[PDB]
């Protein structure tokens, strides 16, 4: 019912992606599709576990660096930034500016604004 | 919209218990998070476990002001409340 | 939604048949329209049955 | 004394029967396990999401 008229653009790229998708949906038997589905689910679960571990390590490192930054007592981080890192809400420039701000002034509660959603790239009849 | 705070509170208590290693009848509906055997880099792990259990996304500012399992349950209930709209 | 989900997956050629009541309020307005036929023909068009 | 050794040697020779019949029963178990995936509720959930 609500498809945004930007997903129904006919381009030279979409008329080959059509071949790919139609292969996947009509030329493959559902059994192999199912097996591939299970494997992909398992892989993505492992990837998520790895990402969570990495986020935790990042919070340690930033809590450690804010100490050098402010110099004094704060060993703290912000749960805000941990959650925003786990949900992919920061652009790389934002985390760089945040690292600098921590290492220079502490202020562990001053965070970059937010990342805005990426729009769908269009060129012309090309893609 | 209309959410059953009872079930949410029960399951939040269960998740906290199972996460820390404390028996369920010890974690009181008003017990804070440092007194129950948790620091600062462990109130975020139980936040992650809560999101994983309920499959919702926690708002971040409201997660900076969580101190009692009651407020955690209330945040989660408010998230589940506004889902379709 | 369940009807469409079934038809598109092929699992509809092996379900037990069904009966459904479509109650529409009494309409004697100046219109020749009827949303029973409209809804069911829209369902027959969405799935190409 | 006698009957126990007799049933034991028949046990061993039917184990022989099993050794000369291992690949067939193995591939039978394999095709049974393969046909076991495509009758769960998981597989109908998958078909409906597809
Ligand atoms: C070794 C294990 C394979 C055994 C087998 O029977 O090997 C051949 C199998 C074909 O297996 C067939 O797999 C079928 C799977 O069907 C299921 O899936 C089908 C969708 O593919 C339909 O939905 C069907 O209704 C549903 O039951 C049934 O199990 C058939 O009985 C069975 O012969 O192919 C394969 O493993 C795939 C071959 C890949 C080679 C490249
Ligand atoms: C890695 C690929 C780099 C591009 C990634 C951009 C991701 C992004 O969001 O960046 C983060 C920000 C973009 O910032 C984004 O802006 C958007 C506006 O449409 C929205 O506001 C988003 O919320 C905001 O995050 O990047 C920059 O501000 C510019 C970074 C430049 C990166 C390109 C470097 C490669 C150029 C090499 C050429 C050198 C030649 C001399
Ligand atoms: C000859 C090719 C010339 C191309 C020149 C270079 C083009 C660069 C690639 C274009 C940017 C990708 C656009 C995009 O992601 O669209 C969304 C597409 C699907 O297209 C979309 O697919 C949609 C239907 S669906 O997603 O397949 O269900 C549909 O809404 C839409 O019409 C269709 O565009 O999503 C994909 O999966 C594209 C991934 C592969 C692209 C990288 C390969 C590089 C080639």
From TrEMBL, chain A:
This is Uncharacterized protein. The chain holds residues 129 to 255 of 255 of the full protein.
From TrEMBL, chain B:
The modification Phosphoserine is found at residue 40. One of its GO terms (molecular function) is acyl carrier activity. Residues 6-80 form the Carrier domain. It comes from the Eukaryota. Keywords: Fatty acid biosynthesis, Fatty acid metabolism, Lipid biosynthesis, Lipid metabolism, Phosphopantetheine, Phosphoprotein. Belongs to the acyl carrier protein (ACP) family. Carrier of the growing fatty acid chain in fatty acid biosynthesis. This is Acyl carrier protein. It comes from Chlamydomonas reinhardtii. The lineage of its organism: Eukaryota, Viridiplantae, Chlorophyta, core chlorophytes, Chlorophyceae. The chain holds residues 33 to 117 of 117 of the full protein.
TrEMBL record, chain C:
It comes from the Eukaryota. This is Cell division protein. It comes from Chlamydomonas reinhardtii (Chlamydomonas smithii). The lineage of its organism: Eukaryota, Viridiplantae, Chlorophyta, core chlorophytes, Chlorophyceae. The gene is ORF2971.
TrEMBL record, chain D:
It comes from the Eukaryota. The chain crosses the membrane at residues 18-38. This is Uncharacterized protein.
